[PDB]
Design a protein around this ligand. Structure first.
Ligand SMILES: N[C@](CCCC[B-](O)(O)O)(CCN1CCCCC1)C(=O)O
Ligand SMILES: N[C@](CCCC[B-](O)(O)O)(CCN1CCCCC1)C(=O)O
Ligand SMILES: N[C@](CCCC[B-](O)(O)O)(CCN1CCCCC1)C(=O)O
Ligand SMILES: [Mn+2]
Ligand SMILES: [Mn+2]
Ligand SMILES: [Mn+2]
Ligand SMILES: [Mn+2]
Ligand SMILES: [Mn+2]
Ligand SMILES: [Mn+2]
Lengths: 311, 311, 311
């Protein structure tokens, strides 16, 4: 039971600064001691200085390739994450990656699947994050990592993303919590037949059935590794206010943590990202500790914490 | 795919002014463009001037027949709605009626069932709206339209309501969301054996099962038209604050919209009312746009908007 | 249909004053008239003066036996409750006990099971309330009544608790709503195999299935009496803010009352406690009437109030 907490304080996938403080706040709220208390021998992996990066992020408006913003900076930083996560996993440690915006998942998923090629990916998010380079409207790369990982619109992915291994297939991704899917992303999900469980499916079948279906969707042999990339904006703003792209009608706090328990319970979790905590994007101080404490709770539940006796 | 958005800015079924602004606010939030964007060729039907009516409403306290308030004004305005909705439907257009208080449903239901006689009515509401003329305590006619439509307490319905066709039968109404049913209304629902799915049934079976049961209750052949009359106070005040008669423990925003998707999905929706949005009855500005935007969301979902690819 | 509303304004099981005002506030919000209106011939049983007790509570810091705070005062007051509840039940009246903190359940459960020996106990609570004398960390006796009732850690229960009959067995308690169980309590629940339905089980199976399972767990012959001891902190602070030990991710207001309807519906309810309403522990006035009105609603629903026609 060895874990590396990979710190990815990167905000270059979106406009708003603050998300780069997520790793520090999570760690300040006791993430590492929480994981130690659950039996994990942990250590911190620092990949790059968030303040140097943030400095370069906020200064360099010329890093644009079309409507796409900061592809060079994003490609540089997510390659470092990839190399870090790949090493952690090869070393046989659990990589728990804390963001930072969801563009970091370009490095985490590539890293995990390079070591565990038939790993399934469960993407917990209000958004599909699958806009292509030529299709993105905002040009914010945190809404594009899955298009790059799946190799969509290859013609228009810049050379700076040349490092990304082509290891994720469309039948190894399953979404949970979708409710703000762009028209262009709807077409892609449908054409590629990606298992997508929207808030409609949660409302219709309940969270337990949806989680079961998501695990099965990415686990054919029933034996495969599972990776979860967890965007905190899946959870209704009622519970996670301090986040960049909040959308009404999300998972309750209870559903958000129940999902974690069901996945911990299956015993095949091999990596976890917790992304998009933005402590500055809180109106009140009670909202930062609603958000950061939710990040830590996801981690604890994912990593085996239960309401009743387990050991 | 033709639609007439019927504007019914009437507040004479209840004491509080403001509900007559609902149609304007909904339209200001983009209701017509939303419907156009869903493929509907739309047009606005104006039935009467809400300000002239509101003027006459607020002035004339002598329009009372017993405990019943404003029966003359209500009977006049809802006859105009009836004539308008009947024509729209005969013309083969979808009538989407925006209120205004729920007394307008006296005209909408009569209008739809005069053209589609075996249409079922699903009444989405915290209240049963079925108090009779002699039985009403408040005398507010927005809590009475179904008694007039079903012809209850015929002896005490004034001559001014003589225009109402007797087209709705008790086995063609199904309620969803009930939680503030008056003792006199409880007896009626029970005696007439009206399919009533309270918040107890939603809690007990979940919203999907309840919606299925409601559709079936009013669709015996399984082929019949369906009309939905949607009172926004069904939704917990948490989500719809700006409304006249809010009651604790309602549908979540998610359930409120899930219901719409399930009905859109059945493909037999033939008319929709969205009533009781009262923008003045908001404490804050965030609450008016919680309410008005909910009205528009109900419309979009009812009229086919989905979270994932549909077309 | 005879009922005694047993007033137990005791706060000596926990640090915060205010919970001793619960019975007065509940009664001020119309609890007795509510019960009368449901057909019960009621009367108030006063067990002790809450202000004299509160005076002695707040003054005497020397009443400590180890980490345990106020065992003498708690043992005195809960013996009076026991004697009162036992008499009410022998008289064939329904004891509806209003608290006061949950330490009062030491007297209510002992009282009911002394008259109805195979009565099951459903404990509705965020907490297991089963810490032992030597195991308690806070030493607050409201988190210990079930250890004393089950006779755990007999060696370290003081002589002042000598009066407690040993009538409750581990297979006659079922928990609903657990989400803040101490590590020491987890071990006990597991070792004694106590039916415990946590918020995980509610999320996983839904409240209806959980309530069914809880009733069955304590009703083998299917015929047994049922007692419910209802801690208002089971309900998410969203709905019950004014309480001493609030924990995030609780029952919704709807689930909280649905549970009551399901139990009323089974027809074997023989006693009810409603505990831990603390009106002083409210930030705003809207929160006291969120809490006190919830207490009264639990009572009405438990005691037969329904959304639709029943009689
Ligand atoms: N789809 C969006 C949102 C991306 C969210 C990224 B995540 O899940 O890590 O927080 C927004 C698209 N946008 C919608 C409104 C109109 C303009 C485009 C985009 O930027 O592509
Ligand atoms: N039942 C009420 C509420 C009507 C709601 C109309 B809707 O659904 O369009 O908003 C209220 C009855 N009232 C209850 C409290 C005591 C006095 C009578 C009535 O006025 O008849
Ligand atoms: N488990 C607690 C809470 C008791 C709640 C009583 B009830 O259900 O009537 O409101 C708290 C234990 N505490 C947890 C935090 C660390 C210190 C010990 C205790 O005091 O034993
Ligand atoms: Mn994302
Ligand atoms: Mn997102
Ligand atoms: Mn209504
Ligand atoms: Mn209503
Ligand atoms: Mn308790
Ligand atoms: Mn408790």
């Amino acid at each position: 039971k060895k874990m590396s907490i990979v710190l990815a304080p990167f905000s270059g996938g979106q406009p708003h600064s603050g998300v780069e403080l997520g790793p520090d706040y999570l760690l300040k709220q006791g993430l590492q001691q929480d994981m130690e208390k659950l039996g994990w021998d942990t250590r911190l992996e620092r990949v790059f200085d968030g303040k140097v990066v943030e400095a370069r992020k906020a200064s360099d408006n010329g890093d644009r390739i079309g409507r796409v913003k900061r592809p060079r900076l994003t490609a540089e930083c997510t390659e470092k994450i990839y190399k870090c996560v790949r090493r952690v996993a090869e070393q046989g440690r659990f990589p728990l990656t804390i963001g930072g915006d969801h563009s970091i998942a370009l490095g985490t998923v590539a890293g995990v699947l390079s070591v565990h090629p038939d790993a399934g990916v469960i993407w917990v998010d209000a958004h599909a994050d699958i806009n292509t380079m030529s299709g993105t409207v905002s040009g914010n790369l945190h809404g594009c990592p899955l298009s790059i990982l799946l190799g969509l619109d290859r013609e228009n992915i810049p050379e700076c993303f040349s490092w990304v291994p082509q290891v994720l297939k469309p039948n190894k991704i399953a979404y949970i919590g979708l409710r703000a899917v762009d028209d262009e992303e709807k077409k892609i999900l449908h054409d590629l037949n990606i298992a997508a469980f929207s808030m409609h499916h949660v409302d219709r079948y309940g969270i337990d059935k949806v989680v079961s279906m998501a695990i099965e969707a990415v686990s054919p042999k029933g034996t495969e590794p599972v990776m979860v990339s967890y965007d905190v904006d899946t959870i209704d703003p009622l519970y996670v206010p301090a986040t960049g792209t909040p959308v009404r009608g999300g998972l309750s706090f209870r559903e958000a943590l129940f999902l974690c328990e069901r996945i911990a319970e299956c015993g095949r979790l091999v990596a976890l990202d917790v992304v998009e905590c933005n402590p500055l994007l809180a109106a009140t101080e009670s909202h930062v500790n609603d958000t950061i404490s939710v990040g830590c709770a996801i981690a604890r539940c994912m990593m085996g914490e239960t309401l009743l006796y387990t050991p």
